[PDB]
């Protein structure tokens, strides 16, 4: 029983053409829409090999024994295997070890070792890396020592004579157990963030797919908003719910924030989506901050005017100003440009917008928001991000246009790829023609 | 402009009756359904005071200076303030300090100090507790020292002469900075898990509300499944999407797992919801694992038979066996019973079910899955959970009924409150009458 009977043993992305397979991934709906958009599918095996080769190279360039990962998103990067991802972000039951020779082990939940079997780069599946109070009570230490010894033995074999173990984040008991085995603990996030920083050819294809799925879901949310707002019952949550459903229907995973806000609730920014019944002749501003198809994040922001009357002239000005902000900064994007050059040379927002502008003008994106962060010059920390842009980096370009004490904020954001010769904006979503004038 | 014009300055839960308020919470839809079910609303101010008094008492009983929390769910428990919760679970930008005298400080995202203002128990709002590589690059240490000094100064004033600082989870750089200020770092999760372990009168009311909202959302998912399955397009994700939407429409927050599985994909258990097109005459088994209204978790599980033909006799047997398992174990619930007594005296699953049974027979629940864990005797760790049940504890009672190499699994789960005299099952959701026979 096939997911695509109109194909052989595999899907166009190399995954098993079997409706009864363990693996999840995009839905028929999403595949259909991408075929129509004529988007090349990612070869998942190749994508996974690329990530593992790159991550392994990073461990070796640093002279480390290995990299031990407890962050679910780092685990995803290294193995592409999901397991109760959201539960995992705050209950650290999983671990992945990447040894300097490329050898990779997964400690998974005790009763689900099969979840990472589809990726033969994961050489072993074990249990017992769960070193928190909920899972072990007053008996975490015994287990911490068992686990740490396992790590020691693995790296004696796969990284003989190396003492430095990068760890992304670990529970205190785990840290001390690892130290008691003789490991010098290094910052794992500097390793993973820099590895994640450059996408390979299949990661690009994947992001193209995810981005499209996200945009279709956003359009569905817009359709619903423009059709319901004014009925005196449809709230911010009702609208936002369309983005949740339509992301899931395309094989998406979750939404990182609650950044949808209507009317006066959009200034100051960062107020959360909730029960406010929306109204005609108001701006709705939102940011997708979305983990979608193939586990790829689409992080884009738009502001919408729903109403028959024209918007106030300051709304139109703010909108056009955000668009100019994004498009100007985007033009700076080229390989070899340093991050702080981007900080220095940012397009300058008007005075009434400086105080409440966004925490950065750009940031990385992959499986979620990622390194680097490109802060505005008045916040840039010297020596913090002294690195060049490289081809394959994918960044979100931001604009928050928010008057101090103001009535509304414009939030705009596009997702862009760095190429050999410059950049390529991956976002196709239109700007609201009424807010653009 | 009021959220409930049919009321004064406040909602029935004490929150501001203003559609333009910063605070989120349940929707008109959810409030309507709870009024009809005649459910008393939680007094939020009182709920928040109860949690703070209890958490503070725990810090003091231990002789600690304070408790520093970076886990978003612990922050929620202490302050009830949300901010990009899911982003926060894996990018630690927030911190809450609870001093031994009750004094409480929030370090929030640099541009959103207002988010915790609605809770005057949060005495200060600062920034700069964000000590990870994405937010700070190669300059985390400078900031780690600034933050750690702030903590030192606060506890000199609010906990003079005390050196022990419980921390739930912290980044390595933060840990060393705190140690360099002279703090003895203790396990924060033993503090928070034990505080969270007992709910007050308003937390109970809140959970009653959340549980109802979750059940209505599940019914909506059932309606949709029973009406669409067989159409040859409706997949696991399509069905699951109804739970996402309908939780959000009631002010819910997120779903911790992907535990919905159709047909043969339900054995082994822990396979994830995905693109498999569902079919008539198959079991769908699922677990809500849901963070709903008022931020309260409803964690329940059901199995459904959709089809005109009767289910196989082993499915009916498995179902009845799970129900017996849950109802028998539930009968053990009383204050003063020790956790390992529950382990020892569990109802015994049949032989064909022992190998693949669930990781526990019971666990705590509050803002998510919580301490304690009640493991089956063949996994129980002696001395790990030597504690009595107390009134106000709220536990989920589990049954996974899964034949080794089998065709399907039955997953059932109810959420229960411990009372003075025994227990009270809070779950009202029916069992599938076709699977019950
Ligand atoms: Fe964003
Ligand atoms: Fe962004
Ligand atoms: Fe559950
Ligand atoms: Fe459970």
- Burial class, B176, CB count within 10 angstroms (exposed 0-12 / middle 13-18 / buried 19+): middle
CB contact under 8 A, A248 and B240: yes
CA distances from A340 to A351, A362, A379 (A): 22, 11, 11
CB contact under 8 A, A167 and B172: yes
Place of tokens 């498009």: A327
The two tokens of residue B418 are 């411990």
- Ramachandran angles phi, psi of A434, nearest 5°: -70, -40
Q: How far apart are CA B221 and CA B243, in angstroms?
A: 6
- Is residue A144 within 8 A of residue A176, CB to CB? The reply is yes
- Restricting to A residues 119-138, those with a Cβ less than 8 Å away from any Cβ of B are 132-138
Q: How far apart are CA A141 and CA A133, in angstroms?
A: 10
Q: How far apart are CA B378 and CA B343, in angstroms?
A: 9
The H or E element containing residue A180 is: helix A172-180
How far is ligand 1, taken at its centre, from the CA of residue A288, in Å?
A: 6
- Restricting to A residues 355-374, those with a Cβ less than 8 Å away from any Cβ of B are 356, 358-359, 368-373
A244 known member of a binding site: no
CB contact under 8 A, B269 and A111: yes
Q: How far apart are CA B284 and CA B411, in angstroms?
A: 10
Place of tokens 């459910």: B39
CB contact under 8 A, A89 and B87: no
Q: Which residues contact B273 (CB under 8 A, 6 or more apart)?
A: A24, B236, B237, B240, B258, B259, B260, B261, B286
- Burial class, B351, CB count within 10 angstroms (exposed 0-12 / middle 13-18 / buried 19+): exposed
CB contact under 8 A, B383 and A138: yes
Q: How far apart are CA A107 and CA A149, in angstroms?
A: 14
- Is residue A203 within 8 A of residue A48, CB to CB? The reply is no
Name which of B355, B293, B242, B255 is nearest B33 in CA terms.
B293
Mutate to test the interface with B, among A137, A140, A379 (most CBs of B within 10 A): A137
Summarize the annotated binding site of B for a divalent metal cation as residue ranges. Answer: 287, 289, 299, 363, 398, 413
Choose which CATH entry (3.40.350.10, 3.10.129.10, 3.30.565.10, 3.40.50.150) describes domain B1-199: 3.40.350.10
Please name the member of A87, A246, A272 whose beta carbon is closest to the beta carbon of B256. A87
The two tokens of residue B317 are 């047997």
Q: How far apart are CA A206 and CA A394, in angstroms?
A: 12
Q: Name the residue of chain B whose CA is nearest to A21's CA.
A: B265
Q: B171 to chain A: which residues are within 8 Å by CB?
A: 169
CA angle B95, B99, B104 (to 5 degrees): 55
Burial letters A88-100, b for 16+ CB under 10 A, else e? bbbbbbbbbbbbb
Dihedral angle sign, alpha carbons of residues B22, B23, B25, B27: negative
CB contact under 8 A, A86 and B254: yes
| B268 cis-preceded (ω within 30 degrees of 0) | yes
Name which of A298, A369, A300 is nearest A73 in CA terms.
A369
CB contact under 8 A, A172 and B175: yes
Q: How far apart are CA A155 and CA A102, in angstroms?
A: 11
How far is residue B251 CA from its own chain's centroid? 15
- Restricting to A residues 252-311, those with a Cβ less than 8 Å away from any Cβ of B are 254-259, 263-265, 268-277, 289
CB contact under 8 A, B381 and A137: yes
Beta bridge partners of A304: A284
Using DSSP, state whether A370 is helix, strand or coil: strand
CA distances from A337 to A331, A341, A348, B247 (A): 12, 7, 19, 45
Q: B372 to chain A: which residues are within 8 Å by CB?
A: 137
Name which of A188, A190, A185, A191 is nearest A164 in CA terms.
A185
The two tokens of residue A21 are 């397979």
Mutate to test the interface with A, among B140, B234, B272 (most CBs of A within 10 A): B272
- Restricting to B residues 40-69, those with a Cβ less than 8 Å away from any Cβ of A are none
Q: B369 to chain A: which residues are within 8 Å by CB?
A: 87, 91, 134
Name which of B374, B320, B309, B383 is nearest B350 in CA terms.
B320
- Is residue A333 within 8 A of residue A326, CB to CB? The reply is no
Burial letters A105-143, b for 16+ CB under 10 A, else e? bbbbbebbbebbebbebbeebbbbbbbbbbbbbeebeeb
Find out if CATH 1.10.1060.10 is the number for domain A200-437: no
Beta bridge partners of A315: none
CA angle A314, A317, A322 (to 5 degrees): 125
Instruction: Report the 10 Å Cβ neighbour count for B313.
Output: 9
How far is ligand 1, taken at its centre, from the CA of residue A56, in Å?
A: 30
The H or E element containing residue B175 is: helix B172-180
- Is residue B295 within 8 A of residue B367, CB to CB? The reply is yes
Q: Name the residue of chain B whose CA is nearest to A276's CA.
A: B19
Q: How far apart are CA B58 and CA B54, in angstroms?
A: 6
A413 known member of a binding site: yes
- Ramachandran angles phi, psi of A172, nearest 5°: -45, -45
The two tokens of residue B313 are 């006799």
Name which of B103, B97, B121, B99 is nearest B45 in CA terms.
B121
Q: How far apart are CA A309 and CA B109, in angstroms?
A: 36
Q: Considering every ligand atom shown, identify the ligand nearest to the alpha carbon of residue A360 and give its number.
A: 2
The two tokens of residue A48 are 């996974």
Q: Name the residue of chain A whose CA is nearest to B355's CA.
A: A111
- State this model's resolution in angstroms: 2.2
Q: How far apart are CA B285 and CA B300, in angstroms?
A: 11
| A372 cis-preceded (ω within 30 degrees of 0) | yes
- Find the Cα–Cα–Cα–Cα dihedral A141, A142, A145, A146, rounded to 10°: -140
Please name the member of A27, A258, A384 whose beta carbon is closest to the beta carbon of B237. A27
- Is residue A152 within 8 A of residue A181, CB to CB? The reply is yes
- Is residue B402 within 8 A of residue B356, CB to CB? The reply is yes
Q: Name the residue of chain A whose CA is nearest to B19's CA.
A: A276
Q: Which residues contact A410 (CB under 8 A, 6 or more apart)?
A: A283, A285, A303, A315, A318, A319, A321, A322, A399, A400, A401, A402, A435
Q: B73 to chain A: which residues are within 8 Å by CB?
A: 90
For chain A, which residues make up each domain, given as ranges? 1-199, 200-437
Q: How was this structure determined?
A: X-ray
How far is ligand 4, taken at its centre, from the CA of residue A22, in Å?
A: 21
A289 known member of a binding site: yes
Q: In sequence order, which ranges of A290-415 are alpha helices (DSSP H)?
A: 313-331, 339-344, 351-354
Burial letters B244-275, b for 16+ CB under 10 A, else e? bbbbbbbbbbbbbbbbbbbbbbbbbbbbbbbb
CA distances from B258 to A298, B19, B55, B86, B285 (A): 20, 33, 32, 15, 11
Q: Considering every ligand atom shown, identify the ligand nearest to the alpha carbon of residue A326 and give its number.
A: 2
- Restricting to B residues 317-346, those with a Cβ less than 8 Å away from any Cβ of A are none
């Amino acid at each position: 029983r096939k997911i695509d009977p109109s194909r052989g043993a595999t899907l166009g992305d190399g995954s098993p053409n079997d409706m009864n397979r363990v693996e999840i991934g995009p839905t028929q709906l999403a595949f259909a829409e991408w075929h129509t958009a004529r988007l090349d599918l990612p070869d998942l095996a190749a994508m996974r090999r690329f990530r593992h080769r790159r991550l392994t190279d990073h461990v070796v360039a640093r002279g480390y024994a290995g990299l031990l990962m407890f962050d679910p998103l780092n685990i995803r990067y290294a193995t592409d295997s999901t397991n109760m991802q959201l539960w995992n972000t705050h209950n650290p039951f999983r671990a992945t070890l990447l040894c300097a020779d490329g050898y990779m082990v997964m400690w998974d939940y005790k009763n689900s070792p099969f979840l990472s079997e589809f990726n033969p780069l994961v050489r072993e599946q074990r249990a017992g890396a769960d070193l928190f109070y909920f899972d072990r009570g007053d008996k975490v230490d015994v287990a911490a020592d068992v686990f740490a010894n396992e790590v020691r033995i693995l790296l004696r074999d796969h990284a003989p004579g190396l003492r430095r173990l990068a760890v992304d984040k670990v529970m205190l008991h785990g840290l001390r157990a690892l130290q008691a085995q003789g490991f010098e603990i290094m910052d794992g996030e500097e390793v993973t963030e820099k590895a994640r920083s450059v996408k390979g050819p299949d990661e690009i294809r994947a992001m193209r797919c995810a981005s499209h799925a996200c945009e279709v879901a956003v359009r569905k949310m817009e359709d619903f908003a423009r059709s319901k707002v004014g009925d005196g019952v449809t709230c911010e949550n009702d609208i936002w719910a369309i983005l949740h459903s339509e992301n899931v229907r395309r094989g998406g995973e979750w939404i990182e924030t609650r950044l949808l806000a209507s009317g006066p609730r959009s200034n100051p920014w960062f107020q959360e989506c909730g029960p406010r019944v929306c109204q005609r002749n108001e701006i709705i501003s939102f940011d997708t901050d979305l983990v979608g198809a193939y586990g790829i994040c689409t992080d884009i922001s738009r502001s919408w005017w729903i109403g028959d009357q024209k918007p106030r002239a300051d709304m139109i000005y703010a909108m056009q100003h955000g668009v100019e902000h994004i498009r100007t900064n985007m033009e700076m994007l080229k390989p070899g440009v340093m991050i702080p050059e981007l900080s220095a040379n940012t397009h300058v927002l008007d005075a009434k917008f400086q105080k409440q502008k966004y925490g950065c003008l750009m940031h990385g994106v992959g499986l979620c928001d990622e390194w680097p962060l490109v802060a505005y010059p008045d916040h840039a920390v010297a020596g913090a991000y002294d690195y060049p842009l490289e081809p394959g980096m994918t960044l979100c370009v931001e604009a928050l246009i928010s008057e101090e004490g103001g009535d509304f904020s414009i939030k705009l954001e596009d997702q862009v790829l760095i190429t050999e010769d410059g950049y390529e904006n991956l976002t196709k979503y239109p700007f609201d023609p009424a807010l653009m004038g």
